[PDB]
């Protein structure tokens, strides 16, 4: 009925420095072109982590830093290379590009802790 984005409150990055989380969205209709962007929020200054465009049922391909798999309205994201400085809030942004209407969805953010 309106756009919603859900993502976990907190995830622990592995010792391998890889963190995974599911980002799922709800839409009034059924989009067929979706663009997913991972943003990093740090004191109102936001940077792009990765982004990918995605036809549903056609697999989600980005790289170098993010991999992703798709399943219905869910996107399983994996972020690799996390060191020490990257602990922070990672926002899932989902743009439903086609068919109209366009929808923008901004998640609440996942606090990724890296050790």
């Amino acid at each position, epitope marked *: 009925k309106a756009m919603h984005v859900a993502q976990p409150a907190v995830v622990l990055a592995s010792s391998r420095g890889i963190a995974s989380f599911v980002c799922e969205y709800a839409s009034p209709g059924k989009a067929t072109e979706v663009r997913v962007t991972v943003l990093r929020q740090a004191d109102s200054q*936001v940077t792009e982590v990765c982004a990918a465009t995605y036809m549903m049922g056609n697999e989600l391909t980005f790289d170098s830093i993010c991999t992703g798999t798709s399943s219905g309205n869910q996107v399983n994201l994996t972020i690799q290379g996390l060191r020490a400085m990257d602990t922070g809030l990672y926002i899932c942004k989902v743009e439903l590009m086609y068919p109209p209407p366009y929808y923008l969805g901004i998640g609440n953010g996942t606090q990724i802790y890296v050790i």
Partner: antibody
Amino acid sequence: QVQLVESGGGVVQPGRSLRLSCAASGFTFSSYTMHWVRQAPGKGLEWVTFISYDGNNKYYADSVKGRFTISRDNSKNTLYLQMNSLRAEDTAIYYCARTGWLGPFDYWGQGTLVTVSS
Amino acid sequence: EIVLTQSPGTLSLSPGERATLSCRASQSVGSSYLAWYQQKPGQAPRLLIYGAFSRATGIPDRFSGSGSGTDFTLTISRLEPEDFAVYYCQQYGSSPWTFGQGTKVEIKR
């Protein structure tokens, strides 16, 4: 410093065409979606059109659908509005605007006046 | 289309007073998708507030936003001379992007 400089405004007769340009500086142009917004004299703001990062998705307001075309040239850091079949009521200040990564229109050009009249 | 209705049309206030501006939406707008803009005559609009509550960079703290669902408020805690101007709300969560019709904040004398 983020900068959006518009050009191309002026007087055009009804039914004719006119192209506006917006030259962008101070940021990675291809990383942002863009819009045109217009303002008839003494009136409010009306969204005109939206274009995605690489130009593959374009949206239009109903009042201009089938008459206006938005485009962008990412290698020249330039946004365009091609207006066809112009009408008197398209007379307005036209602004380009950048979409912030969190959604709002965070930077605006200073606008150029388009007068449609014979 | 999500219609935004601002009120009042014109606020007449003295400098130094508190200004409260309302924006009502014809259907629910996520708080993450509501912005306020300021416009002075002869100038382009300027982003003030986004995500209903968050100030754009360099916007002074006397400006604050609140609200949710269909009902949003812009507050200016003390009007300075440069704050007398037109204010527009906007939803940017779905197409068509829509604006309120504007509230003019005027000097009362």
